[PDB]
From a paper:
In this work, we report the identification and characterisation of invariant surface glycoprotein 65 (ISG65) from T. b. gambiense as a receptor for C3 and its activation products in human-infective bloodstream forms. We show that only convertases of the AP but not of the CP/LP can form on the surface of T. b. gambiense and that ISG65 is capable of specifically inhibiting the activity of the AP C5 convertase in vitro. ISG65 adopts a three-helix bundle fold (Helix 1, Lys36-Lys84; Helix 2, Asp100-Asn144; Helix 4, Thr259-Glu300) with a 20° curvature along its longest axis. The TED of C3 is the main site of interaction with ISG65, whereby its helix bundle follows the curvature of the globular TED.
The ISG65:C3 complex could be reconstructed to a reported FSC0.143 of 3.58 Å, while ISG65:C3b was reconstructed to FSC0.143 of 3.59 Å. For ISG65:C3, the local resolution predominantly ranges from 3 to 5 Å, with lower resolutions in the disordered head region of ISG65, the flexible C345c domain, and glycans in the two glycosylation sites. With the exception of the disordered regions Ala666-Ser672, Arg740-Leu751 and Glu1634-Asn1642, C3 was well-resolved and could be modelled in its entirety. Positioned above the loop (Gly684-Lys692) connecting the two N-terminal helices of the ANA domain and the N-terminal side of the longest helix in the domain (Ala719-His738), binding of ISG65 to C3 is predominantly mediated via hydrophobic contacts and four hydrogen bonds with the TED. Three hydrogen bonds are mediated by Tyr293 (Tyr293ISG65-Glu1110C3, Tyr293ISG65-Glu1111C3 and Tyr293ISG65-Glu1119C3) and one by Arg77 (Arg77ISG65- Leu1109C3). The interaction between the proteins is further facilitated by the almost perfect complementary fit between the convex tip of TED and the concave 3-helix bundle of ISG65. Mutation of Tyr293, which is responsible for almost half of all contacts, completely abrogated ISG65 binding to C3d. A second, smaller interface is formed between loops in the membrane-proximal region of ISG65 and the ANA domain in C3. Within the interface, we could identify two possible hydrogen bonds, Lys97ISG65 – Glu689C3 and Glu302ISG65 – Gly717C3.
Residue numbers in the entry:
A (entry chain B): 673 to 739, 752 to 1633, 1643 to 1663
B (entry chain C): 35 to 145, 203 to 226, 256 to 312
C (entry chain A): 23 to 665
Write the structure that this text describes.
């Protein structure tokens, strides 16, 4: 009783310092973790934990003894911030014949479609008189009748959604009679029919809202329009609503890379000709009735696509396939564009590409700097997240980027020089090794006691590389930079020999070459360690090997050794796996910079004179492309809508790239085996006593735990949860988790729409390997939907996308109630497309014979059901063929089993039972692919009849007798 | 015999390497101690000044307990006093090394084997190589080894001074980033 | 015994029109005069010699107008502020005076769309450039937008040439950007030492479901009110329906910047039909704070925080009311516009500005002088009331006390105020005094004003004085000057002055005279008075609705608006939401704010008369100098003396 009063009284004690801990302890943890368990997550000192434990124990005991609304009054009050956007922003001059100084002018404004009181402010600026201000003018606009149709974000194909419309009346002491109707649309099955229109009368009482529900069954994919009309009696009102909804296929959209090849007819090719074969993609899990698309891209130069994408703001974010919300990823705006600009400034390509885009690129860089300023701390240090401990690595990276960008844009000298001073004086140790006092991000962690020095060497090399750039910018401000540089270089040179990891060797060698100390035996270490004179690779790492190779390439370019460089360029080019490029930001930036540096510092100019011939197997005419240096655009594209392998011929001169990428829809299935993760997702009901919001209809609890499968993870793992149709997450729980003292998560975005379905991305600082890191939260369902399909959850690391896994979760049900929104007609609208509708339960022999023999009919099989497999999206029937009446294009022997795929909604339509004879016949479109034992998809044109092994028996036997009398002569 | 010619070529190559590589490098590594000791003394003085200075808000030092401030100031003053005495030893050593390097360079200017480049050692091998070789240009070679050993001793003096300075240099930097976090008097004084 | 005198403003501004007054006494025939300006250390002849004839037909009065061109400073690093010598040769003798000079001339007004913004929204702002006379001027300006931490984010340089001052500007807020009170600075290239700045706040995205309003029944809480503070709370939706549920209310005391929450002021109230009442008793308020004295807590404010929870839904909304100043007297008496110096024997007038605790002027509140019980001067609409008293002949400091006597209020609740003043010393000890009296009315442009001149001195020599010289100061410049003739035997004189638009927003009249003097040294006696005029636009600007009054406009329908303004005027329009405008109270760009800014920069800083003959001129912003020893002290400070 009076739990809030007790909580307030207990919080009254303790000073203003140790009161946040107690207040957080008062809050109920979303998960079922004990107070002792929760105290482990406290990052404050040893005094906050004691108060937190005391308050947790006290409140737990008090509530247990007690076992009204128990909510603590907020101390930091918040007010409404979102307001209607201002308009009428224009300037006009009064030019009319004055009358004793008065000059009238008539305006023509258009009031916005909203119900609010607007205020118009007028300020005049005369010459003889001066500035003056008039009083505001109030304009009030309101309506008596309002309609609002509520629809979900997206609906899966072949679903049962119950859309609704809300009617609002703003009259007092007067009810409103209205008639509401929904217009028929052939795309989806509705209550209204073509012959009969659905209309209904409703009375809205004064000062109240009324709900009108509706049910629609979507059939066709794409974008559909739903329009509702309302007519008011006794008053001339003809208002209505029209809203667009999205219907998506039943599956997950996945775009996959097919091939990535390097074109160089002279060197790589033989006799000045190169022939390359691109095999067909492996679309073995394509969802039925879905279209795939293949794209072929020819790049004249290895750095054309990135250079063109960086300048454009629209395509800037497409260079990566990962979210960018934190500190380092926010640099995506600055690092690429700058490089591109530089690559265009030194080389004579601006004229061809276009000079006018340079100003836009500078504006993008300015906006990137403005966004980056958000992460600055008062100590001139940048942290991974807002209000967190500063990190040396991020600070050094930001310093380097700002030093590079100072020439192009106006970078404040104060911030850069202060960051340099903080890096030098504070973090650097007397010995000359930079220390880190923040969680590791880029796998710089120590690998052990023997590998402890490796972390120090790597961090020192990176910080030295960053600092060397910021040498001539402000050297008078910081007079201790040369000494720190010399000490770091001496330390790096001292222990360069005792290096095992390829990345550390490469970075140290690059730093020493930049200083100019990589001579003698040290150099022998850098060149010899390379494998096949081509790459710097280590087992188990994919996206870090490319970065190490880029560092080695930069070191080689610095050393002025162009004999060993060309081989590495080919390997670097053929490292595009994710989509059509590199996923990780760091790897992409390093590859871009290395390739740009190689192109800029070229002893000879390799003019582009590429001639490419493509001869698709389906297409008859051949396609020819001619890529030349004078061409304004060095990028060619081709699109096809068929899975096939094709040959390409390249002749001429120059080094180019050819990328073939396929896009298709994949089926929903749990990953066979995770790489280095173990994900588990569970969605369960919730107690009915929970106070759901006004609009929500149901509530559930979703848990999503995981554990690393290695020595340790660190890094920054990101979880992605694909929400469902209608279901939405609870922001209160996420806010409590993120802003609470026991911080379970780093940050949640919940503000992206990259995928068709709603998504929630959670950023995690680390994943425990010894134990299992877990988190649960509540979700609410607003709309009433049936036959809902499962969602998905993906767990992956950022810098290494290969280590990832996926899981699927479905709302718990398991009930043969086959709940369906239909009452009497709507399912009859649904089963029409399922399969050919027989004219009668048992049609006559003549009709059956006439319908059996048609030009489109190719196969007629009499079979016996073997097994039926339950599922969620598509039902499967393992069937064995007993007798053959008419063989189709494919040849099948007697006794060979061919599986059958049917839609879920047809489960109660076909009415197929195991171990029963049946007859059927369909069209050639039922064949799916060409895999051995091809599956038969039951389409609309697929006749099926029961075959008995007693009037019905006599009639069916008489019908059977006439089926094999003739082999369908006509 | 060709062995004598090979030995002569090896000795010439070693002498050239010492004259052009070791001599120049050695001098540049002797004048850096003075520039580092003074820099670290200045940084320590700046850190002390920032502590309880004309203003506050110096990260965690602002809320630091009154008792801990006295100990921090005492240890900073002790380190500053200890580190000062090392300056003259490096200052004199720098000029001595410079003069000796100039003399050695002047002396050097006054005055088969390729497969042996794996040796990569030119520290004190000149006198010994001449020793095996024996078993107008010969006279200057006698004092080169003595001058090189004297330079090595002079550099060793500065190296020892710098290494000794580290003992007092490291303690101040430790307590700095120790108190810089949320570390209370306990651990601090315990380690001090 | 001819005399020649010259009067100039204390501070002369560069690139501005300045005027100097020349007068001669006891002169026969034409009196040519040549005025020149030179640099303080050296001679540069910054201005050509200006010659004017003080013919007897003009009663030996004239003026010279000039503007000092902007030239390279002679002593900028060698001195703090530059001085300029101005000399005048009337006849055989010459006069000279040193004057301080400044370059700052002009103002920049920044108008913003809203005060609260969210990430992704666009900020639209304008800048208006005006000159000393509040007229458009073409000059280069530089504008910077800076984040709260002090790191500029945007910089631009614009020019108002070929435009009527308006400089439209827009900016885009990044999605992920610093949150705080961002600043926008703007200043001229010529004078970077003066900067005009505005501020705007950016907040997170928030949208409440239902509106809750909590307000007290009284604007202020009286100390001895045993009833306590009563607060009413209402909660309603945006579509009309009320809110029913339960609310938690907590009171607290805010002082300076800190706030203390009373632990025994938490109450739970059931809100039915969107209404609820709470009461904070005197006993709880007194016992909450250790301070036992009830008079000591005067000054602190009271705030209330309320939270509302519905019955069916789980939606919550929080509301707070901050303010409610604690005052022991509703009305307050202030001594601001009244002179602080009294002339012995002469009647003394005082001005009292009765104001409400919030700050608004009072209306219908009687006030009187304690001890004398004089006529209760009812407060006017502007809030200023004038009270007259008779001074004593003794040469002692004067003390006055004033109190309000509003009806149906207790004696204790009545406010009180005290004031002290020092006597005005006479140079010759002749008890010569001049009094300028103005009938205080609601004067506005287009209304004559009568000024009464009174003279007090011995009867031995009264025929010598036959005229008075008066000058008017408005916005620093000498707006007008003239003479008033007095016939022998008439002690009191009347001067009708026409009030025009130039006198806005106020003016100061300084009137003086001179006489031969029995001792032998010419004596000068001066007096000053200040008058305020209603603040209003020079022209007019009206925004009416041209559409006929048929029915309230519906959304999406086209309508018409009638804009009436001065001929050839550039009109700027903007449509802002009512809620945002009402929520904003400090950055409103009103005519009153502009006039306050204009009046703030005034060379003269004094309510009324000074202490000596030179004191009056110095306080009024004039410098009186002549050939004889009579001279005023120089000014070596641009700003007025600090309190």
């Amino acid at each position: 009783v009076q739990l809030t009063e007790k909580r307030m009284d207990k919080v009254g004690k303790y000073p203003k310092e140790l009161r946040k801990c107690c207040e957080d302890g008062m809050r109920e943890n979303p998960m079922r973790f004990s107070c002792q368990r929760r105290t482990r997550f406290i990052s404050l000192g040893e005094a906050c934990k004691k108060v937190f434990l005391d308050c947790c124990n006290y409140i737990t005991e008090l509530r247990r003894q007690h076992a009204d609304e128990d909510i603590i009054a907020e101390e930091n009050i918040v007010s409404r911030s979102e307001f209607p956007e201002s308009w009428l922003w224009n300037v006009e001059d009064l030019k009319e014949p004055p009358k004793n100084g008065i000059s009238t002018k008539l305006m023509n404004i258009f009031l916005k479609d909203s119900i609010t009181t607007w205020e118009i402010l007028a300020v005049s600026m005369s010459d003889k008189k001066g500035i003056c201000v008039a009083d505001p003018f109030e304009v009030t606009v309101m309506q008596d009748f309002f309609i609002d149709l509520r629809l979900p974000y997206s609906v899966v194909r072949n679903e049962q959604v119950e859309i609704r419309a809300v009617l609002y009346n703003y009259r007092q002491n007067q009810e409103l009679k209205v008639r509401v109707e929904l217009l028929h649309n052939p795309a989806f099955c509705s209550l209204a029919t073509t012959k009969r229109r659905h209309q209904q009368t409703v009375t809205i009482p004064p000062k109240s809202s009324l709900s009108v529900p509706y049910v629609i069954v979507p059939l066709k994919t794409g974008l559909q329009e739903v329009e509702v009309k309302a007519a008011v009696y006794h008053h001339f009102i003809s208002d209505g609503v029209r809203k667009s909804l999205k219907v998506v296929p039943e599956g997950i959209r996945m775009n996959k890379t097919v091939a990535v090849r390097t074109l160089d007819p002279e060197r790589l090719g033989r006799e000045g000709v190169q022939k390359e074969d691109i095999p067909p993609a492996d679309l073995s899990d394509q969802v039925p009735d879905t279209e795939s698309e293949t794209r072929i891209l020819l790049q004249g130069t290895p750095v054309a696509q990135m250079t063109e994408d960086a300048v454009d703001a629209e395509r800037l974010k497409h260079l990566i396939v990962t979210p960018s919300g934190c500190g380092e990823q926010n640099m995506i705006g600055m690092t690429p564009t700058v490089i591109a600009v530089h690559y265009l400034d030194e080389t004579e390509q601006w004229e061809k590409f276009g000079l006018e885009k340079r100003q836009g690129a500078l504006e993008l860089i300015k906006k990137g700097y403005t966004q980056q300023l958000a992460f600055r701390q008062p100590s001139s240090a940048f942290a991974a997240f807002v209000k967190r401990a500063p990190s040396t690595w991020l600070t050094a990276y930001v310093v380097k980027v700002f030093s590079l960008a100072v020439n192009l844009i106006a970078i404040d000298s104060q911030v850069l020089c202060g960051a340099v001073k903080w890096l030098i004086l504070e973090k650097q140790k007397p010995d000359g090794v930079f220390q880190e006092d923040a969680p590791v991000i880029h796998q710089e962690m120590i690998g052990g006691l023997r590998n402890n020095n490796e972390k120090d060497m790597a961090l020192t090399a990176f910080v030295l590389i960053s600092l060397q750039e910021a040498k001539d910018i402000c050297e008078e401000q910081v007079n201790s930079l040369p000494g720190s540089i010399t000490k770091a270089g001496d330390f790096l040179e001292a222990n360069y020999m005792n290096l095992q990891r390829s990345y550390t060797v490469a970075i140290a060698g690059y730093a020493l070459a930049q200083m100019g100390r990589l001579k003698g035996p040290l150099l022998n270490k850098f060149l010899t360690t390379a494998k096949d004179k081509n790459r710097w690779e280590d087992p188990g790492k994919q996206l870090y090997n490319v970065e190490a190779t880029s560092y080695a390439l930069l070191a080689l370019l610095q050393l002025k050794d162009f004999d060993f460089v060309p081989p590495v360029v080919r390997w670097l080019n053929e490292q595009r796996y994710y989509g059509g490029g590199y996923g990780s930001t760091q790897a992409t930036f390093m590859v871009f910079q290395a390739l740009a540096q190689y192109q800029k510092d070229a002893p000879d100019h390799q003019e582009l004179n590429l001639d490419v011939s493509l001869q698709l197997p389906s297409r008859s005419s051949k396609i020819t492309h001619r890529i030349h240096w004078e061409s304004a655009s060095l990028l060619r594209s081709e699109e096809t809508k068929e899975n096939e392998g094709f040959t390409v011929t390249a002749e001429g001169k120059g080094q180019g790239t050819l990328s073939v990428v396929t896009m298709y829809h994949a089926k929903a299935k749990d990953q066979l085996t995770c790489n280095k993760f173990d994900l588990k997702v569970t969605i369960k009901p919730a107690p009915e006593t929970e106070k759901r919001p006004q609009d929500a209809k149901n509530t559930m609890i979703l848990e999503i735990c995981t554990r690393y499968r290695g020595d340790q993870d660190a890094t920054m793992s990101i979880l992605d949860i694909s929400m469902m149709t209608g279901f939405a997450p609870d922001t209160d729980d996420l806010k409590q988790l993120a802003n609470g003292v026991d911080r379970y998560i780093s940050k949640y975005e919940l503000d992206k729409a990259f995928s068709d379905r709603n998504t929630l991305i959670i950023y995690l600082d680390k994943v425990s390997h010894s134990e299992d890191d877990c988190l649960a939260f509540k979700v609410h369902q607003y709309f009433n939907v049936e036959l809902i399909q499962p969602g998905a959850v993906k767990v992956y690391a950022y810098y290494n996308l290969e280590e990832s896994c996926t899981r699927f979760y479905h709302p718990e049900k398991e009930d043969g109630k086959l709940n369906k929104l239909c009452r009497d007609e709507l399912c009859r609208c649904a089963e029409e497309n399922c399969f050919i509708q027989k004219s009668d339960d048992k049609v006559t022999l003549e009709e059956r014979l006439d319908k059996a023999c048609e030009p489109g009919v190719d196969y007629v099989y009499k079979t016996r059901l073997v097994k039926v497999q339950l599922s969620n999206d598509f039902d499967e029937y393992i069937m064995a063929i007993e007798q053959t009446i008419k063989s189709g294009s494919d040849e099948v022997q007697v006794g060979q089993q061919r599986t059958f795929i049917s839609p879920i909604k047809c489960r109660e339509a076909l009415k197929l039972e195991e171990k029963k004879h049946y007859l059927m016949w369909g069209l050639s479109s039922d064949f799916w692919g060409e895999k051995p034992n091809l599956s038969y998809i039951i389409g609309k044109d697929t006749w099926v009849e029961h075959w008995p092994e007693q009037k019905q028996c006599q009639d069916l036997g008489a019908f059977t007798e006439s089926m094999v009398v003739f082999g369908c002569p006509n | 015999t060709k062995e004598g010619a090979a030995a002569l070529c090896k000795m010439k190559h070693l002498a050239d390497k010492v004259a052009k590589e070791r001599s120049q490098e050695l001098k540049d590594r002797t004048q850096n101690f003075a520039g580092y000791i003074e820099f670290e003394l200045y940084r320590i003085d700046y850190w002390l000044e920032k502590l309880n200075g004309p203003k506050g808000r110096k990260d965690g030092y602002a809320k630091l307990s009154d008792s801990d401030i006295e100990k921090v100031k005492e240890i900073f003053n002790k380190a500053k006093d200890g580190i000062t005495k090392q300056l003259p030893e490096a200052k004199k050593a720098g000029e001595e090394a410079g003069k000796l390097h100039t003399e050695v360079k002047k002396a050097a200017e006054n005055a088969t084997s390729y497969e042996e480049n794996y040796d990569w050692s030119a520290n004190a091998l000149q006198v010994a190589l001449n020793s095996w070789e024996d078993v107008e240009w010969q006279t200057p070679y006698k004092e080169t080894v003595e001058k090189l050993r004297e330079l090595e001793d002079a550099y060793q003096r500065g190296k020892k001074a710098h290494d000794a300075m580290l003992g007092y240099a490291n303690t101040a930097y430790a307590v700095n980033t120790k108190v810089e976090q949320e570390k209370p008097l306990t651990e601090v004084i315990a380690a001090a | 015994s001819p005399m020649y005198s010259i009067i100039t403003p204390n501070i002369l501004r560069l690139e501005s029109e300045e005027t100097m007054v020349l007068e001669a006494h006891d002169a026969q025939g034409d009196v040519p005069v040549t005025v020149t300006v030179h640099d303080f250390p050296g001679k540069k002849l910054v201005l050509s010699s200006e010659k004017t004839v003080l013919t007897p037909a003009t009663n030996h009065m004239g003026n010279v107008t000039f503007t000092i061109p902007a030239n390279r400073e002679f002593k900028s690093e060698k001195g703090r502020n530059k001085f300029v010598t101005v000399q005048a040769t009337f006849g055989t003798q010459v006069v000279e005076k040193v004057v301080l000079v400044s370059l700052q001339s002009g103002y920049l007004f920044i108008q913003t769309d809203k005060t609260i913004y969210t990430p992704g929204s666009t900020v639209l702002y304008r800048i208006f450039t005006v000159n000393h006379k509040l007229l458009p001027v073409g000059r280069t300006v530089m504008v910077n937008i800076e984040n709260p931490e002090g790191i500029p984010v945007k910089q631009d340089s614009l020019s108002s040439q070929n435009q009527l001052g308006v400089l439209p500007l827009s900016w885009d807020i990044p999605e992920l950007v610093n949150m705080g009170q961002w600043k926008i600075r703007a200043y001229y290239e010529n004078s970077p030492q003066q900067v005009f700045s505005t501020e705007f706040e950016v907040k997170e995205y928030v949208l409440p479901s239902f509106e809750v309003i909590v307000e007290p029944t009284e604007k202020f809480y009286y100390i001895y009110n045993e009833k306590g503070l009563e607060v009413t709370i209402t909660a309603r939706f945006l579509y009309g329906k009320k809110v029913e549920g339960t609310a938690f209310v907590i009171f607290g005391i805010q002082d300076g910047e800190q706030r203390i929450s009373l632990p025994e002021s938490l109450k739970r109230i059931p809100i039915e039909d969107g209404s609820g009442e709470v009461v904070l008793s005197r006993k709880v308020l007194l016992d909450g704070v250790q301070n036992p004295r009830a008079e000591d807590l005067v000054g602190k404010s009271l705030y209330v925080s309320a939270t509302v929870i519905l019955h069916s839904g789980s939606d919550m909304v929080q509301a707070e009311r901050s303010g409610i100043p604690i005052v022991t007297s509703p009305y307050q008496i202030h001594f601001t516009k009244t002179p602080k110096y009294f002339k012995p024997g002469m009647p003394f007038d005082l001005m009292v500005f009765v104001t409400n605790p919030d700050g608004s002027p009072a209306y219908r509140v009687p006030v009187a002088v304690q001890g004398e019980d004089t006529v209760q001067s009812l407060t006017q609409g502007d809030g200023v009331a004038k009270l007259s008293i008779n001074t004593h002949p003794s040469q002692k400091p004067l003390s006055i006390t004033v109190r309000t006597k509003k009806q149906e209020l207790s004696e204790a609740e009545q406010a009180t105020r005290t004031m002290q003043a020092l006597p005005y010393s006479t140079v010759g000890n002749s008890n010569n005094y001049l009094h300028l009296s103005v009938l205080r009315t609601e004067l506005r442009p287009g209304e004559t004003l009568n000024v009464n001149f009174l003279l007090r001195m011995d009867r031995a020599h009264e025929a010598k004085i036959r005229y008075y010289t008066y000058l008017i100061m408005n916005k620093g410049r000498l707006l007008k000057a003239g003479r008033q003739v007095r016939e022998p035997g008439q002690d009191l004189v009347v001067l009708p002055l026409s009030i025009t638009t130039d006198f806005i927003p106020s003016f100061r009249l300084v009137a003086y005279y001179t006489l031969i003097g029995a001792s032998g040294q010419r004596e000068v006696v001066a007096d000053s008075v200040w008058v305020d005029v209603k603040d209003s636009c020079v022209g007019s600007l009206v925004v009416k609705s041209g559409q006929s009054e048929d029915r309230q406009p519906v959304p999406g329908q086209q309508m018409t608006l009638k804009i009436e303004g001065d001929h050839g005027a550039r009109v700027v329009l903007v449509a802002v939401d009512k809620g945002v405008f009402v929520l904003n109270k400090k950055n409103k760009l009103t005519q009153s704010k502009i006039w306050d800014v204009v009046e703030k920069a005034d060379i003269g800083c004094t309510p009324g008369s000074g202490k000596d003959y030179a004191g009056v001129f110095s306080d009024a912003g004039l410098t009186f100098t002549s050939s004889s020893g009579q001279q005023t002290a120089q000014r070596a400070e641009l700003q007025c003396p600090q309190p």
